[PDB]
């Protein structure tokens, strides 16, 4: 106020200067992703998709180095656009040199100031520009919220996110904003929480915290299923638990994003995976 800093913040930060990107994938819905700026172009690690949000770490050799949560990769720089977000502050704060409790003061910001968000989810801070002064301001000092404040954890936030897509049409290979397949809905929802998961159900099945007992399932957990009787050992489907014994999924049965009764669903579970941590 403005000097008070919580002991819960680290006294040190390795957070690198980043900007915000939105994928535009011109002319299509996807872009190949690589693990270097000089890749074996035949061996892309995966793809990223239209209207996904990323952090931009930099550019090299015609590629953008992008980040979603703990995952980073390289995509053609023409597949995304840089984003800045105008907002205002609601409480006096300092712009600090870094997102920690030992940064130097770049600029005092009075309450009600017009600012521009340049990066988000910076370990409890936004990176902003105020009157040309650039640095890190505590998240709660700004009006804009990059994710929901409501919810006890990111799992509940993920459940709300898939609920916002109820009624969207099923289309194989899509991940929003208007059409989805089962695994694209999962990846999209966690993209909006700055959490990376892979694109296909059979890989989503292999990461995240394993919830061994279904009694311990919570909103935002994903459930993978084996639904192909001609390949009965292969994971082919996925949905998100949203509480009260229901999960939401994009299904060809109805060709729509819809609720489904978990225990009445007539296909075997593979794993229950928790990709949220807070």
Numbering used by the authors: -2 to 275
Quote the study on this structure.
NlpC_A1 and NlpC_A2 consist of the C-terminal NlpC/P60 domain preceded by two bacterial SH3 domains. The NlpC/P60 domain adopts the classical papain-like fold, with a central β-sheet of 5 strands displaying an antiparallel arrangement. Hence, we concluded that NlpC_A1 and NlpC_A2 are dl-endopeptidases with specificity for the tetrapeptides in peptidoglycan and with greater activity toward monomeric muropeptides.
The structures of NlpC_A1 T. vaginalis AG_119910 (TVAG_119910) and NlpC_A2 (TVAG_457240) were determined by X-ray crystallography. The similarity to other NlpC proteins allows us to assign the active-site residues of Cys179-His234-His246, present in all TvNlpC/P60 sequences. The active-site residues sit in a “T”-shaped groove that is bounded by strands β14 and β15 in the NlpC domain, with the cross of the T formed by the β3 strand in the first SH3b domain. A surface electrostatic calculation demonstrated that the slightly positively charged active-site groove carries two pronounced areas of strong positive charge. The first of the two areas is adjacent to the catalytic cysteine, and the second is at the base of a small pocket at the interface between the NlpC domain and the first SH3b domain bounded by the residues His195, Tyr43, Trp44, Tyr46, Phe193, and Gln184.
